[PDB]
Amino acid sequence: MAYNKEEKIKSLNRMQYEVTQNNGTEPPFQNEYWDHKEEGLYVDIVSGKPLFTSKDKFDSQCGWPSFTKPIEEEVEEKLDTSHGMIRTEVRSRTADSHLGHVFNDGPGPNGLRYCINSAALRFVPKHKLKEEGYESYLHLF
Amino acid sequence: YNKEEKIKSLNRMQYEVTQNNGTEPPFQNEYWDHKEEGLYVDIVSGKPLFTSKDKFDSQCGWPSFTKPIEEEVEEKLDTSHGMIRTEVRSRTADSHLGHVFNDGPGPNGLRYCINSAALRFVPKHKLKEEGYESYLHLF
Amino acid sequence: MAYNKEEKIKSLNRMQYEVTQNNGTEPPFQNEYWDHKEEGLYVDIVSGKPLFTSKDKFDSQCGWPSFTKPIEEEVEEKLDTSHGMIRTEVRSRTADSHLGHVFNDGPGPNGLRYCINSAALRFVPKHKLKEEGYESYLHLF
Amino acid sequence: MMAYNKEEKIKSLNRMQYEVTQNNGTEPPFQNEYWDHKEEGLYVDIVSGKPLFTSKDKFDSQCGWPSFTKPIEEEVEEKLDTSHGMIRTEVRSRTADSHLGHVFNDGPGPNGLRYCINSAALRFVPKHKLKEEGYESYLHLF
Amino acid sequence: MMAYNKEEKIKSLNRMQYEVTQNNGTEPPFQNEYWDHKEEGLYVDIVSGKPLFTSKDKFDSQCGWPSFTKPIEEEVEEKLDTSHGMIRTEVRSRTADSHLGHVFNDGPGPNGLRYCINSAALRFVPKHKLKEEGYESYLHLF
Amino acid sequence: YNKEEKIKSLNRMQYEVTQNNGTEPPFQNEYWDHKEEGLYVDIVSGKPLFTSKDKFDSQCGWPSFTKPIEEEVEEKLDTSHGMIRTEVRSRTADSHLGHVFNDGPGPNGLRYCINSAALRFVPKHKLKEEGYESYLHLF
């Protein structure tokens, strides 16, 4: 009803909350996944649902995790006119946590650079996908 | 959560009991003498099965109860090993739990004897934290 | 006994040690001797001394072999106040191994009920008491 | 290896492991831990812990035992085996002097060799554990 | 000593054992396993397992730590130790390179040395076992 | 102040040294080489036992003094561990301090070897505000 997600959120730490709940952003380079390259999945830190895979991730120099594309209708994009700018925010569909923004200067074909906060993700190694419950995606590798 | 994988991650005795319908030894458990307050969930489904409210100080060697939770535990006719007893198991996680005998504190006069190795205990002060908020009213 | 006991103890499997030396209890309906009903002699698994008889072994629903009463003075009753309780333990004399416990809910004429672990016992058929050196007890049949 | 250290490890090996590595036995086919194993990692000598084969050179065989196209470094050794009345090439680990199995020239190229090894003489180490357990020096193979 | 093996043994050490041997610490005096130990045997490296001292050269000391007059076959090495603002001589294991302790020239022997070793860095092996343990190689010492 | 409760809040080492007459590791404790002007007190009774004026360098790895302060310290034969030594314990709290050896820097030649584990150092610039003014005169 209203105590699984509302509870998970309550158990988040300062930054994780600030980001996901207050749409803030973590420091560049001083986060956990910006340079991380282990094979695996990046799940919603709140709803636990798959958001990005280690395969679409790449090396940018912005200081935050960067992917070219997201996962199956699990990540939503929406206009963000806040802060006197005009950007495209990225949020998760199920847990509606702020993730970050998309930019059109990526390396992929479509040229998208999904710039996400480490603080909104729980990384799950490939050798643990089946245990955690992500056998359904174990093929994406 | 995946029943198949979680079961596959249970301890030998937790598997033996819940899956092979085994019986853990007496007095050598974590909940036979347990008297703390809170819920006892299904080690597999996480669904609550018994409450500290109904638990009573029996001296048979396993955590006994006078009453189960609003049907989360079912009664099955068990005629194994030459006897005619009443087996108790979880409807959702379908885990073996134990047996129900007609010899408890009453008025039910029932002694739901359950294996510790089939139950995870969730402290009464960590229920809203673990998501068992709709059960706190029972305390 | 002396050193025989040592090598003899080193023989026992995990459960027999846990039971006989560590006073643990084997699981119910899941031991070799609760069913049995075989005409023989239940010997001490450590000292080889006769502890119980197949004749004094009655059917029970507890799930452990049970005997109305033991043989010789090889079985000894000790006041057991283990686990915040008052009971009556039973152990062999010569070997000093935990057998189990006795009660007063068993069939008369004495009313006692010796509930011993299978782990602490070693069966011996009637056809083998003579050759196995138990000639002296063979009369009990 | 040092007498006591080797002796220590040998003392650990269960029946089958001891039987094959020390007595040159063979494990039943299709009934061993690594024939169909395919997880990316290192196949380590169960006695000396020295790496013997990599998952990268393992191939699906229908013989029933883990098959590799080649061994790692000079740790695996070939040796004439005229036992049982025939002529085959045995393979043993140099350090532990552990009997591994045999090599056949019916392997899937390029060298056409088929190293048929018993799981009983190996201990798999996952790639994601390599550094942690002190196999960094091999982590480069992946 | 091979890195991977080295690591397995270290992972096996307990709190204090790790602290001393790895972090160069010292176990509490009089409250260790071999200070008052006096059994005919070998005291081997708890990591490399090589023999470090003999029960023979071990002697009673009121210091509270295994005291030996000398080590065996250069498996123990001395090294200057100018830490804690003092001047002492550290004693280290060759193969395993674990802190053992210190030496002092206040020994009772013909050469007056006093090797003060933490029990934690040691694992006693009785003589009547030396031959099955793989130490057949040292039985002659006794 | 309460004895049982004052000690019930002690450290693993503190309780060991203090209560079990154990002893800490050399060079690996708070004051073996500490030389700040002030007084060392009983972590338990909070009473003065030594002054840094009596503390000196000892390559043994444990704070060492040539003498204690008044009656807070008592001597006692400790023929344990198969040897004859002279233990030092506190008068009030009755906690194991360590031992006295007759190899000190004199003039008495006594070396009081104490465990940092049974001490609380108090700097001269806090002696008053802490209540040890009547001791401050010792500097």
Author numbering:
A (entry chain E), C (entry chain F): 1 to 141
B (entry chain C), F (entry chain D): 3 to 141
D (entry chain B), E (entry chain A): 0 to 141
Task: Give the authors' words.
Oxidation of Met to methionine sulphoxide (Met-SO) damages the proteins and can alter protein function. However, these damaged proteins can be reversed by the repair enzymes, methionine sulphoxide reductases (Msr). Two distinct Msr enzymes have been classified for the reduction of Met-SO: MsrA reduces the S-form of Met-SO and MsrB reduces the R-form. However, enzymatic studies demonstrate that both the enzymes share a common catalytic mechanism based on sulphenic acid chemistry involving two (or three) cysteine residues.
Our crystal structure of BsMsrB was found to be identical to the NMR BsMsrB structure and was further used for structure comparison. The specific activity of BsMsrB was slightly lower than the MsrB activity of SpMsrAB and of mammalian MsrBs. BsMsrB also has a low Km value, similar to that of SpMsrAB for dabsyl-Met-R-SO.
